[PDB]
Amino acid sequence: EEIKSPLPVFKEGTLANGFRYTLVQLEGPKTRVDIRLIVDVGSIDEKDNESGVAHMVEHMVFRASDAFPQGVSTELHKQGWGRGQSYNAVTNYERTMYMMSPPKGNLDLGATLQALSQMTGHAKLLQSDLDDERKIILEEWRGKLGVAERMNQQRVQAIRHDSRYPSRPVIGTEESINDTPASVLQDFYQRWYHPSNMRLMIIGDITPADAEREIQRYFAALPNVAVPTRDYYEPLLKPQLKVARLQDSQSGSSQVSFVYRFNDKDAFGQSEYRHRLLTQITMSAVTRQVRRQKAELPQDASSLVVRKSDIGKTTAALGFFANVMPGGHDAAISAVLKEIERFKRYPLNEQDITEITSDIREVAQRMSVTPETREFADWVQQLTIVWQQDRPYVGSQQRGKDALEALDTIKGEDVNRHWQRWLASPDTLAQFSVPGATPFTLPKPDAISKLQKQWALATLAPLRLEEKKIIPELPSVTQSGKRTAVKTFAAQKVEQWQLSNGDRVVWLRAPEAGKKVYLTATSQAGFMATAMNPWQAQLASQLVNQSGPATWSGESLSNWKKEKTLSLSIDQEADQLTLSGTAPTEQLASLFGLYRELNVAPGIDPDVMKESMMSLARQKANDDQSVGGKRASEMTKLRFGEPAWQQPEIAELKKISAPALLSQWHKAASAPVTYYLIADMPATQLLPQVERYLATIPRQPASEVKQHLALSGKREATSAINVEPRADILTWSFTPHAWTPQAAVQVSIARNIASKYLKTSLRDDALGIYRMRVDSELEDKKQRIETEVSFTSAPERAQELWTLAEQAFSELPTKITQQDVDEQKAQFIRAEKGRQGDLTTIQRRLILSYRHYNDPRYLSNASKLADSITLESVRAMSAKLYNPDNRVLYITLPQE
Amino acid sequence: ATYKVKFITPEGELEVECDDDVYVLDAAEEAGIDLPVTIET
Amino acid sequence: DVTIETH
Ligand SMILES: [Hg+2]
Ligand SMILES: [Hg+2]
Ligand SMILES: [Hg+2]
Ligand SMILES: [Hg+2]
Ligand SMILES: [Hg+2]
């Protein structure tokens, strides 16, 4: 797709049996092709006894067929095709789609078409193949069982109530996957898989005459059988105020919404294209306005947004959603209904509509005179979109002319009328998500309409106007400090500078910095420092990171950085504070200047704070009764005895004030800093900027913060609380070992080989292991080899998995082969020399060096790292990866 | 082994913290972020 | 939906 190809020539056809095809010839990259077939059947067409059958047929048509009794995907493998790269399929509510990218492009077109015709017209759907395949469909189902899917099903259930969608999820049930016989799949195939229910599109380097012959060859003989007529794609819209709870015990969702459902494709006798353009203008106007209405929200509600979505072929949902402070759902739904009422009473901002309409006209103008040229993958993207909805493609040049035509028939009166139609839709829905165990009784419809009538009768202020944009500028800094000492490490190209405020600079003049300056500012101000309140310090760090300096805002901070191509981020860990940033060398004063302003003039953006409190509070409510909440608590007790700190109660959360947080930040900002600066410039250029912006920041000595250290010993625990049918097995082990680069390298090698050995030694598929992980490192701050072995598996033999891994660990130090080390040493040498000149690696090693030696020696003599990899050393270290004296085992089983 | 994932959407940047063993949409839903490493959507 | 992409 290197040279863009122009708008292609399209040829369409219909075989006698009703099979439709679309041929799209690109000047295109040479020989590349893309071949799609759609069968117009999805899970919505399943009957009550056919749960998930559409998706199972999708799998099964790659099995035995009349011409390939060993399976269609078997032959595809033989001829070089790869699962997911060369062939793929997807099933959704309404269609099943098969996609092919033959490895040899257009030369395999006949082969591809033979394969597709086999799948769609000659699949055997054999019981014996199905019993083999249902293990693969059950895995697909297990990996789909999280909170995100259960909540998605909650959303479909509510917003698509009174339709076929809620009872027809694509995957179907574990019962049907396990019990449904091939005979049911066969009847479904024979009901729906007929040529007039099918269409095919071929894109790329093709001769349309030749492709049409291959298509006649492989599809013309398929018998012309009708499929049932269907008119059940829409929810049954009726006047109503439905109330729903969106609920899952593992979800932190905390949210109210009010939703309008309506026929969105009805253009009311006017232009379909013009209608869609009215929708874009309106949604853009409403999106602009509803953001300004944030000023009107009470403390219980935030981030009110408007979202429009398809919920059928013709039905759409227009919804107002807002985040809710847990326990404030009643106040929040009222606040949402108040704003909806305000939109019913005032017209949309005329200037917004003027501007938005003008932006569109400028793009439609450019489109209408620019010749359309795209890369291959982009052509495929554009064309599949229109083809999936069974519509002809209209080029961007023609569509620019159509927009300009429609824009001439569109005044703000139309936009307002378009918008008020939506808000007058009689089919309505109110939704509540209330996290955890928050007291909640679902409002009755009358309670909701009561609030509607209260606001319909109320006096309401006009829509908010656009606020002036604040244009941030860094202050002038006239005071200067001084460098008071220089220590030189010429062999590493490093200078170390003491500054008058007690900070220091570690400056590496690395040519690899190019025309950029890289800053890492560290200090001992982690949130576990003695003077701080842990949770509040952490919230403070996050709020200042997003807000920027006192007189700025989160948004203006983000624009200002983009305009200077500059980054700077706060990260407060338990034991240290790191501010990291990059800028072009010409922007140095802006990088240092912003750094200093975060230190002495931090800001708290009131909207950011309100949003962060809601995030913390809904998570608190969820974590207090969630599975993950209990696992975190149990792992914490097993490994540490007590939590180092905790989140507060929601009631304390509500009371936190900006000055209390800024107090915490200033405590962190006062610990003295080491500036790791990587910049290829002369000292004379860097020193004045360091003395002006960095040596002038007030500091007081900080103490080193004690590490949170996992306790010695052997302890275990087993909890049957998992809501999904899986077992989670975690095991932790550690051995104190002094850190050196050599020792750290040996641990990583031992863990590579141990990873291989422990995965074959537990390779038996009867154990039921879905996922397995062996992690081990010589943690340099704690100076201990920490090892972590994780399993996710079927419950039945989960109690055997750690025993077998413990087994495999005891064997490992003698089973390690000289050949094993040889290929690791060789592959390490490859990665190490790939890391030469790597800025990230250089930065990390400069900081490691200073942490452990208080000098930059580690930047030299990386070459003799490889030399520490031997059989005798890797094995001596493989013995220390697991320490039976320090072993914590935690087993989560499905709930009883 | 905790990491941080950032999300780009028409409303704005959203950030969530997830374990190694955690699917990305599950950590968002557990965090109470309503969507449908730095991944794009 | 966006019928004419602007940004
Ligand atoms: Hg699937
Ligand atoms: Hg055929
Ligand atoms: Hg920043
Ligand atoms: Hg301060
Ligand atoms: Hg800890």
- Which amino acid, residue A319? G
Q: Which amino acid is at A580?
A: S
Looking at A693, A711, A729, which one is the last position of a domain? A711
DSSP structural state of residue A405:
H
A44, A146: one domain = yes
Does B1 contact A at CB distance below 8 Å? Answer: yes
- Say whether both A322 and A347 belong to one domain: yes
Looking at A448, A466, A484, which one is the last position of a domain? A466
Report, in angstroms and rounded to the nearest whole number, the Rg of chain B calculated over CA atoms: 10
> Checking DSSP bridges between strand A714-722 and strand A887-894, what pairing results, if any?
parallel
User: Residues of A forming the annotated binding site?
Assistant: 55, 59, 140
Q: Which burial class, exposed, middle or buried, applies to A517 when counting CB atoms under 10 A from its CB (0-12, 13-18, 19+)?
A: buried
Which tokens is A299 given? 């403390």
> Touching check for A336 and chain C: CB below 8 Å?
no
Identity at A617, one-letter amino acid code: A
Ligand of minimum distance to the alpha carbon of A639: 5
- Resolution of the experimental model, in Å, one decimal: 2.3
CA distance C4 to chain A (A): 7
Residue A137 is inside which H or E element, if any?
helix A127-142
Do A300 and A320 sit in the same domain of this protein?
yes
CA atoms of A270 and A287, how far apart (whole Å): 25
A579, A570 Cβ separation under 8 angstroms:
yes
How far is it, in rounded angstroms, from Cα A772 to Cα A882?
Answer: 16
Q: Amino acid identity, residue A631?
A: R
Q: Which amino acid is at A563?
A: E
Owner of token pair 């949210």: A255
Same-domain check for residues A399 and A492: no
List the one residue out of A643, A618, A633, A610 whose CA is nearest residue A539: A610
Cβ-Cβ contacts under 8 Å, C1 against chain A? 276, 279-280, 308
CB neighbourhood size of A182 (10 A): 17
| Facing residue for B32 by CB, picked from A152, A321, A618 | A618
Name the residue of chain C whose CA is nearest to A367's CA. C4
Most A CBs within 10 Å: which of C2, C3, C5, as the mutation test of the A interface?
Answer: C3
- The CA distance from A474 to A882, in Å, is 53
A252 vs B25, B30, B36: nearest CB: B30
**DSSP characters over A174-194:** HHHHHH--HHHHHHHHHHH--
Q: Of all helices (H) and strands (E), which one includes residue A554?
A: helix A554-564
Q: How far is the CA of A769 from the centre of ligand 1 (A)?
A: 20
Bridge partners of A647, per DSSP, are none
Q: What is the side-by-side strand order in the sheet with A427-433?
A: A240-245, A427-433, A255-263, A315-324, A301-310
Q: After which residues is chain B broken (C to N over 2.5 A)?
A: 36
User: In which domain, by residue range, is A271 found?
Assistant: 237-466
> Is B17 touching A (CB cutoff 8 A)?
no
Helices (H) and strands (E) in chain A, counts: 28, 25
A207 and A291 in a common domain: no
Which of A423-450 are b and which e, b meaning 16 or more Cβ less than 10 Å from the residue's Cβ? eebebbbbbbbbbbebebeebeeeebee
In the block, residue with structure tokens 């306005």: A289
Q: Please give the Cα distance from A547 to C6 (Å, whole number).
A: 28
Cα gap A265→C1, rounded to integer Å = 12
Residues A297 and A440 grouped into a single domain: yes
Catalogue the long-range contacts made by A474-479 (C-beta closer than 8 Å, 24 or more residues apart): A474/A549, A474/A590, A474/A593, A474/A594, A474/A597, A475/A593, A475/A597, A475/A601, A477/A593, A477/A596, A477/A692, A477/A693, A477/A696, A479/A692, A479/A696
List residues bridging with A517 in a β-sheet.
Answer: A583
Method: X-ray
Q: Which chains touch C (3 or more CB pairs under 8 A)?
A: A
β-partners of residue A520 are A580, A676
Whether A254 contacts chain B with CB within 8 A: yes
Pairing of β A784-793 and β A727-736: antiparallel
Gap between the Cα atoms of A632 and A611, Å rounded: 25
Which residues of chain A neighbour C5 with C-beta distances below 8 Å? 363
Distance separating alpha carbons of residues A758 and A752, to the nearest angstrom: 10
Total length of chain C: 7
Same domain, A84 and A177: yes
- In this complex, which of A273, A276, A360 lies closest to C6 when CB atoms are compared? A360
A135 plus A162 within the same structural domain: yes
d(CA A511, CA A39): 58
Q: What phi and psi values does residue A113 have, to the nearest 5 degrees?
A: -65, -35
Q: Which helix (H) or strand (E) segment is A430 a member of?
A: strand A427-433
Residues A244 and A300 reside in one and the same domain = yes
CB atoms within 10 A of CB A359: 15
My answer on whether A217 and A260 are in the same domain is no
- Give dist(CA B37, CA B22) in Å, integer: 13
Q: Provide the residue type at A362 as one letter.
A: E
User: How far is the C-alpha of A336 from the C-alpha of A525, rounded, in Å?
Assistant: 42
CA distance A783 to A780: 5
> Which of A678, A711, A744 delimits the end of a domain?
A711
Question: What is the C-alpha to C-alpha distance for residues A361 and C3, in angstroms, rounded to an integer?
Answer: 12
Structure tokens at A506: 């570690």
- Tell me the pairing of strands A784-793 and A769-779: antiparallel
Q: Which residue of C has its CA nearest to A362?
A: C6
User: What is the count of structural domains for chain A?
Assistant: 4
In angstroms, the CA A222 to CA A193 distance is 10
Residues 6+ apart with CB under 8 A from A83: A73, A77
Can you tell me the distance from the alpha carbon of A185 to that of A124, in angstroms, rounded to the nearest whole number? 10
Is residue A456 located within the same domain as residue A585? no
Place of tokens 């598929």: A765
Count CB neighbours of A4 within 10 A: 17
Answer yes or no: do A251 and A186 share one domain: no
* Cβ of residue A276 closer than 8 Å to a chain C Cβ: yes
What is d(CA A162, CA A102) in angstroms, rounded to the nearest whole number?
Answer: 43
- Where do the H-state alpha helices sit in A247-349? 272-292, 329-345
The DSSP secondary-structure symbol of A549 reads: B
**Sequence-separated (6 or more) residues with CB below 8 Å from residue A348:** A282, A285, A286, A289, A412, A415, A416, A419, A463
How many other β-carbons are positioned within 10 Å of the β-carbon of residue A827? Answer: 12
For the residues of A471-507, what is the DSSP string, one character each?
Answer: ---PPP------EEEEEEEGGGTEEEEEETTS-EEEE
Structure-block tokens of residue A215? 């298509």
CA pair distance A856, A833, nearest whole angstrom: 19
A671 C-alpha to center of ligand 3: Å?
20
Quickly tell me which residue has 């901070």 as its tokens. Answer: A557
Please identify which residue in the block is written with the tokens 């932790």: A732
**Euclidean distance between CA atoms A252 and A240, whole angstroms:** 29
Distance (Å, whole) CA A26 – CA A24: 6
Residue ranges of A for the binding site for Zn(2+)? 55, 59, 140
